[PDB]
Design a protein around this ligand. Structure first.
Ligand SMILES: [Cl-]
Ligand SMILES: [Cl-]
Ligand SMILES: [K+]
Ligand SMILES: [Mg+2]
Ligand SMILES: [Mg+2]
Ligand SMILES: [Mg+2]
Ligand SMILES: [Mg+2]
Ligand SMILES: [Mg+2]
Ligand SMILES: [Mg+2]
Ligand SMILES: [Mg+2]
Lengths: 368, 374, 376, 368
């Protein structure tokens, strides 16, 4: 079968909101590691609004954080879809441990890739992260024509043998990249193919029939918030596993670590990755469920899709996980260092499959 | 094989679901006057305000602010103590006014449909129960006798854990393991009265007694009283309950919220069609549960690929190729066609925006009316 | 042994049922302000008018006309073509206006109240009745709550009748098949009969009737005598208390006489029937029999019934007999009128919801007579 | 062993007054036009009577005059008595609008007939006694101090053996009788006991413990609509079997014979009575159901409560019924002579168990 995943650039209006929500979270954490933050952002023509609840001892200039985050992402002109200098900023923020809410969270891993992530998502997010890296770090004489909005989608043809996923070929790569009026389509295409697609997509999975589409619906000068509304938590599948596995519905950005929607998902990722990395299966889905005010999870579930190593079964894996891993929120927070202001980096490019040293949920443990 | 699994639901007054309902109320308001409207309507809320924003192409003449205020009034937010008062809140409307069948998909979309014979609704039991609890609370609160249940307030949530046995891919619920209900209420009712009310009038009404036992763990406001709720307690946004809206953690999700989007958004209409297909397969007895996976490609009307996973439950003879042949003979997944076949250019969407989009048999939900397949 | 049996229901817009709903809307309006109200409220209707008459003793200050007009609006009578328009109709009010912990008031006459229950359905009601009333309730729900551009051709009047073929084994009733389903639905002039019939079959019958009891020979009759555009009060006069069998058990059980709607709970014809239902439902729910008729005989000036009689039709659980069941019932239940009213919370404005769809077999929060007790 | 009570009311009871007016109007139409369709409802309260519904007729009827004459004949000629035919308001809201074996039913509906060998009338004893008391009060008054309102209730102690009902004793007789103000209670009680109760009730079922109550709630001088609102069709259990058997819900009075609510119930009575009179069972309940526009019944049901004669069962009885009796409306209307103006006589005192020659549904057929 064919399977597709999407990623979006840091300048996509929804991801802009996630990044602002987490920039505010980090700003609070830098001064008060005990901050509680539930920060939502939305955006459209000429404005950003930040709303929700914060309990902090930190003294943070919320508007200044918003405007600086938008500046760093590159929205410095109305022509691009938003200007940090001219936009309106609306601030409506209200100023044995149990979970802070109910909810379920899933973690997933697969040995398809070195990241232990599904290949479609690895590739789409590699494309968008590379575009953002080039835009922000390349010389303006070469790359100044790039604007912040964009997305990529990758369709892979799979074979599925006894639960094991074997990519056969890359079927389609779709890239949308916002740009200024002065660059012609041919140059856009050549730049993206040579400096992005061929840099991150393995040539051994491409062939002459691979469909490569770059701004296929026409030029893309009009973008950002002026072109499309954005909101925090509207890219939760981009943020996690790209359509694979399952999702409990909870968004990550703008939430401090006492929100199990984030910390429980991070821990479930650590567990599934550890099971797969230890060679006990090829693919693993973990579901953890909490109840408000209750420290131990109401439930835990493991599915290896029939790929468990001979000698192991999903029930034995759960027994092991219960011996090794602790899902009580206070322990998750301490073990994963979730009071550190590390979260802005998670809010674009996917929360999982990431190689930064500060993402402890991606450092697997050996299980036996 | 034996395992635990949980699903959640939220009440109509939960702040996120409040936004979904406003967004779909505005969509319906446009479609009743102009069935060809394009709508991409977002709503967000926090203490004392609702903001509607996004884009609309319509010939309709709609009083958007009155639609907002009337929707919030109907949900029951009529006093600050409840968390929002439709009479006093600020309302911002930032909606920007901008027979063919072969229109292509807009991107490399993934649509999923799921069904299972665990319930008469052909939905997973964990999700059926959690959403039944929240729907029943909403029904009692809104339609009940005020001198009896006027102490209910609009916010609330539920979560249900079921212990399953799995025999050859077939899911047989063994018992209800945990039921968690959080219900907002006024200051005058005591916890014992809340808990007895919820147990007798909601849980025992909607949860099958043969799956409950003395060990079933029942948690009702376990973290203390819940008087402060709604937008005063918690910000809401459209499209932040997409798993409640679909299958409660079962099946799969490709991304993309439903509410506030007209049917030309295939993230919505394609998901509805995929549900109809899975439901029809299970309803016809061709398997006990299945996942239907539809892969679209940009500029192409027919799906690039169709994949059906029966989890090993297919009726003998109905191998994957046979099921695919049947589905492709009966069903048309082209966006232009699925919109007409499901009658989606019709103001039917407000009812979808609380209680789940699937497993409910309303006259206007054609994706829940299964086709007999052989 | 096999036999056929039929029950009927009518829609909330049926003229007789419209009157029942208005009478209980007035009762609830009074009780909401004065739980001690005495109400004996009759309603009748014909072209362009509703008349409310009878007797009320209340401290409530009620705009009776507005209660009537809002009830008619909610039912959907908003145009003369449908048979009544709440905006134009005359509402004629001819109501003759006139220690609260006493429990030992006697019955007012030699009353007979009956309760019935049967394990044929989850509702513990006879299947013929469950299906007929499910059909009409679903029609009402679609008409009132559905999308107007889709179902706005529906008009408020209508009826249904359902015949079930039963097997009877040792007094136990086992539905064998649905024999005949009859539905009459009022509609506007623009919808064709084939669309009407397909709509009713797919969205009503197949939704509420269990498919395993339907077969190729099941007779389905939908507006069989022709079109049904002319209906409601303009076509057919209506009066309170003319649907007392739809209101109860559909021909099963028994009825001692006396309508329910418009009467507050001190009228034991109503409260006593509710209590008898709770007892019969509790016996069946507890598994002590498969079907149960509970008969209560009151005497004038006496609070406790003169006689209590239970018939289990030979279906009593092994170990129980009718005499043992009566001993149980007499230990658990109190049939004194003042006690019935307190135990069932009947001085509460709970009655409007009873007045369409049957008073029994529905599980609303405010219906305590449908919340069974475990008996052993 | 149990107690069972039935009620009857006098012709001046406000509900029964409405039944009588409705049927007086039906008879008035039929006497001029035997093909009349009539659906005449009546309601009443202090000082007023309203007749409302639908009529299709060739007759020329002064409806107001029928109303006043019926009320005069019942005896309401003064406001002291509760109603004065001379001065009351009469409101008229009556709106004026082939092959016989093939005439369909005019409506859907379900109707029961019942018979029991407890009495020569083949009716339940409780009902026989209660209606005999009220009919006798009316006869004495109409054919010097009685007034038109009144009611009677009789409680009988029964044994039920194998479906057969055996009266053991009369437990309670309750009689309310309206009267002139100048009559002393002792005279009222002696008259009712000696000239009615002891004449109607069999002495071998009376004993010293029989509870006999005559106006136990006090004097009763004002009655009729002044005492209580009345409506047509609100005494349907009085009209039929007094709580025995079953009821389909349909009222009789004010309806011509094309209303199967009436004609079907009359035919069902004839069937049950014939089965019991023929000695084929001791007790019999018949249910017939019709659908609108359909001549043949949708369903027929016979229950003999286990009392069928040796050799018979409910199925054979149904076969016999289907051979002998025709429930098609056009046919039963002819067989029972239901186009003749006979209906005012039915409208108080019970429709069944009556000996007047014009009630053909009480003339049983011998069946084998
Ligand atoms: Cl939430
Ligand atoms: Cl009554
Ligand atoms: K979301
Ligand atoms: Mg978005
Ligand atoms: Mg998409
Ligand atoms: Mg929120
Ligand atoms: Mg009575
Ligand atoms: Mg009528
Ligand atoms: Mg005299
Ligand atoms: Mg009355």
């Amino acid at each position: 079968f064919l399977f597709s995943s999407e990623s979006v650039c840091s300048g996509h209006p929804d991801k802009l909101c996630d990044q602002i929500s987490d920039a505010i979270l980090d700003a609070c954490l830098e001064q008060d590691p005990e901050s509680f933050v539930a920060c939502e952002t939305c955006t459209k023509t000429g404005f950003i609004m930040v709303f929700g609840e914060i309990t902090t001892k930190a003294n943070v200039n919320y508007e200044r954080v918003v405007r600086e985050t938008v500046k760093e992402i590159g929205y410095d002109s109305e022509e691009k879809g938003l200007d940090y200098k001219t936009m309106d900023v609306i601030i409506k923020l209200e100023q044995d441990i149990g979970a802070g809410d109910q909810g379920m969270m899933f973690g997933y891993a697969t040995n398809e890739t070195k990241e232990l992530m599904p290949l479609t998502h690895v590739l789409a997010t590699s494309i968008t992260r590379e575009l953002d890296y080039i835009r922000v770090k390349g010389v303006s004489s070469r790359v100044g024509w790039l604007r912040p909005d964009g997305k990529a989608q990758v369709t892979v043809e799979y074979n599925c043998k006894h639960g094991v996923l074997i990519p056969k070929r890359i079927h389609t790569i779709l890239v949308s990249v916002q740009h200024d009026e002065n660059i012609e389509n041919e140059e856009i295409r050549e730049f993206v193919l040579e400096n992005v697609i061929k840099k991150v997509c393995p040539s051994d999975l491409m062939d002459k029939e691979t469909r490569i589409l770059i701004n296929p619906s026409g030029r893309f000068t009009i973008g950002g918030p002026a072109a499309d509304a954005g909101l925090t938590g509207r890219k939760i599948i981009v943020d996690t596993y790209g359509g694979w596995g399952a999702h409990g519905g909870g968004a990550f950005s703008g939430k401090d670590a006492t929100k199990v929607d984030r910390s429980g998902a991070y821990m479930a990722r650590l567990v599934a990755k550890s099971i797969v990395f230890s060679g006990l299966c090829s693919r693993c889905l973990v579901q953890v469920s909490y109840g408000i005010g209750i420290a131990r999870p109401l439930s835990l579930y493991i599915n290896t899709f029939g790929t468990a190593k001979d000698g192991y079964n999903d029930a034995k894996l759960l027994e092991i996980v219960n011996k090794v891993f602790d899902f009580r929120p206070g322990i998750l927070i301490k073990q994963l260092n979730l009071k550190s202001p590390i979260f802005k980096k998670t809010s674009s490019g996917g929360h999982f499959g990431r190689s930064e040293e500060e993402f402890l949920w991606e450092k697997p443990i050996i299980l036996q």
